[PDB]
């Protein structure tokens, strides 16, 4: 059961972010250690 | 910590799978005859490779 705990974010696919910040778990496949990452998107150009 | 990842006994990815056996046979068998010989494995059966 413990190994099924993926998708600790809202979605399983396209996960949520706000103010260009995406906060999701990433888990390794051999040991199973999970870290929570924040991916920040800073536009440099016109997003429109 | 022995070899990191494991597989099911029913998959080709197993080191004990028939795919593993085939790989092991091929890599030895392919060198039995000269490449320009009629008995050369890859001439007779160019599809196995």
- B2 → chain A, closest CA residue: A30
Among A29, A30, A28, A26, which residue's Cα sits nearest to residue A9? Answer: A26
If you count residue pairs, one on A and one on B, with CB atoms under 8 Å apart, how many are there?
3
In whole angstroms, what is the distance from residue A17 CA to residue A38 CA? 9
- Evaluate whether A17 touches A23 at the Cβ level (below 8 Å): yes
Written in H, E and C, the secondary structure of chain A is: CHHHCCCCCCCCCCCCEECCEEEEEEECCCCCCEEEEEEECCCCCCCC
In whole angstroms, what is the distance from residue B29 CA to residue B33 CA? 9
Write phi, then psi, for B12 (nearest 5 degrees). -65, -25
Q: Which residues of A touch B (CB under 8 A)?
A: 29-30
Q: After which residues is chain A broken (C to N over 2.5 A)?
A: none
Q: Which residues of B touch A (CB under 8 A)?
A: 4-5
């Amino acid at each position: 059961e413990l190994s099924q705990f993926i998708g600790k974010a809202s979605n399983f696919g396209q996960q949520e972010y706000s103010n260009n910040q995406l906060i999701t778990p990433v888990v390794n496949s051999s040991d199973g250690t999970v870290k929570v990452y924040r991916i920040t998107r800073e536009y440099t150009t016109n997003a429109y | 910590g022995r070899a990191s990842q494991y597989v099911a006994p029913g998959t080709v990815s197993s080191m004990f799978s028939p795919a593993a056996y085939l790989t092991e046979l091929y890599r030895e068998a392919r060198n039995l005859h000269a490449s320009d010989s009629v008995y050369y494995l890859d001439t007779r059966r160019p599809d196995l490779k």
